[PDB]
Amino acid sequence: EDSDIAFLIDGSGSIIPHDFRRMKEFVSTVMEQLKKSKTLFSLMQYSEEFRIHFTFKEFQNNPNPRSLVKPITQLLGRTHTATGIRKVVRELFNITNGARKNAFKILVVITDGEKFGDPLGYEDVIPEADREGVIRYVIGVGDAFRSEKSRQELNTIASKPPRDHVFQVNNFEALKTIQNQLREKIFAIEGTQT
């Protein structure tokens, strides 16, 4: 009714288990400060395959992100963020999965490397997400997003403007510092005034 927030975490083999932990720390901590009375969460991990960890329907039964994020293990493989977000709009945001209709749907993606080995592109996924009204936010973590040529793909995953939905971090630990802005920009439904 309020909002349906889905988290998309990368499970590539480039990310080390220790850093993958920092990622789960982030999503759980962010999930807590964004835990409202009508806000549900869903999370899907991706590499070459896709593994849903929890949908909105079960998060309603267990509103504790720390107990649903703790048993999360790495998949290991390459990156398939295109086909991944496609599944989010069709499966994660599905009514039968607990997703509510007329509710604000926001998607956040956390990846460490450029999309490699994905049979699908952004052109075949993004325009679909834009239709249903799913707003996205992307977080770039790693050397893969240090070049402006790579930053462009981040601007494709997220919604316009890029200077409002694209976050960049050098290490998984520094993710704690972006938690503040993410929280504020996820609560800002419209441009307020000073």
Binding site: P127, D130, R131, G133, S159, P161, G191
Partner: protein, 58 residues
């Protein structure tokens, strides 16, 4: 007539009116849209506004 009235005094208000942009969609086959307007001036600070538009899908 009434009275010759030249530049007696300038009007105050803001340093200018708000800029009205058009709703530029992100996707042709239905999608979200964006709008941005800025306000500048001498004493007026750079005020930025970014709104979101919705396609009718008619």
């Amino acid at each position: 007539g009434k009275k010759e009235k030249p530049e007696k005094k300038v009007k105050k208000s803001d340093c200018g009116e708000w800029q009205w942009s058009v709703c530029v969609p992100t996707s042709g086959d239905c999608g979200l849209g964006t709008r941005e307007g800025t306000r500048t001036g001498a004493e007026c600070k750079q005020t930025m506004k970014t709104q979101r538009c919705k396609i009718p899908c008619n």
